[PDB]
Design a protein around this ligand. Structure first.
Ligand code: STR
Lengths: 248, 9
């Protein structure tokens, strides 16, 4: 009865490397720059993934741009939490196979408290024992979690497509669960986990803006496409021009 | 324009 599970398994992007030189001594600038680079190349793959998500390419192109601009941070934080879970049991932040943050790096990064919050989020994957299929469904849903306060070009269609992917998450749970009561509870837990991303991503957007503004004094380069996305929509997010779409 | 370029591919 789940109709998207194998599609989502086949369009899932491969793992991206940072290219960080893990022999240099860590600095704030080296760590945040490396993260920006990794972010750029992950964003390229997130765009190819979003384009392959059934129904997405049927939204107006301006809505596709809006959705990616708004949700890239949430999608990438969620994917990174999943990687941390599957590879180091959420003990360290697994940005890339060649950029793992231990405690020390979290301190040098200058964004320690945000790193701790993101590691707590990965621990939620550990406690819930999130399966790969649930992960893929929820990550697809994260592309439908934020919209402009005035809405999209075709709101009606976005609403129906979002409802369709919510239903798919439920179908995956009931395909895997035991009882109707247990699967209802599981849906509740996993939509709460999705909802809990929003305050984290808000804080991360604030930090991102702070860094973007200070990029010259801090020697933190932002690559081209990240710069254009950030300066395009992060001020609007911080100004309250967007509205989270809650799942629970 | 870069995001729009990736979308139009
Ligand atoms: C401002 C900055 O340099 C940091 C603050 C939060 C950071 C992001 C946090 C989430 C993240 C996870 C990844 O796996 C790719 C890089 C990204 C997307 C990071 C890129 C650099 C950011 C944007």
């Amino acid at each position: 009865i789940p109709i998207f599970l194998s599609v989502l398994q086949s369009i899932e992007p491969e793992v991206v490397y940072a290219g960080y030189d893990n022999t240099q001594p860590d600095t704030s600038a080296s760590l945040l720059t490396s993260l920006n680079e990794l972010g750029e190349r992950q964003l390229v793959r997130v765009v190819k993934w979003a384009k392959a998500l059934p129904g997405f390419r049927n939204l107006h192109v301006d809505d596709q741009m809006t959705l990616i601009q708004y949700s890239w941070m949430g999608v990438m934080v969620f994917a990174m939490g999943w990687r941390s879970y599957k590879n180091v049991n959420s003990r360290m932040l697994y940005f890339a196979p060649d950029l793992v943050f231990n405690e020390q790096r979290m301190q040098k990064s200058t964004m320690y408290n945000l790193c701790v919050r993101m590691r707590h989020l990965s621990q939620e994957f550990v406690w819930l024992q999130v399966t790969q299929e649930e992960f893929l469904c929820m990550k697809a849903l994260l592309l439908f979690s934020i919209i402009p306060v005035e809405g999209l070009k075709n709101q009606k269609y976005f609403d129906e497509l979002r409802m369709n992917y919510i239903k798919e998450l439920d179908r995956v749970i009931s395909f895997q669960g035991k009882n109707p009561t247990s699967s209802s509870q599981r849906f509740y837990q996993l939509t709460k986990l999705l909802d809990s991303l929003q305050p984290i991503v808000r804080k991360l957007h604030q930090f991102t803006f702070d860094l973007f503004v200070q990029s010259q004094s801090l020697s933190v380069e932002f690559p081209e496409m990240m710069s254009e996305i950030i300066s395009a929509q992060v001020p609007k997010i911080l100004a309250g021009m967007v509205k989270p779409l809650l799942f629970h | 324009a870069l995001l729009r370029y990736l979308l139009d591919k």
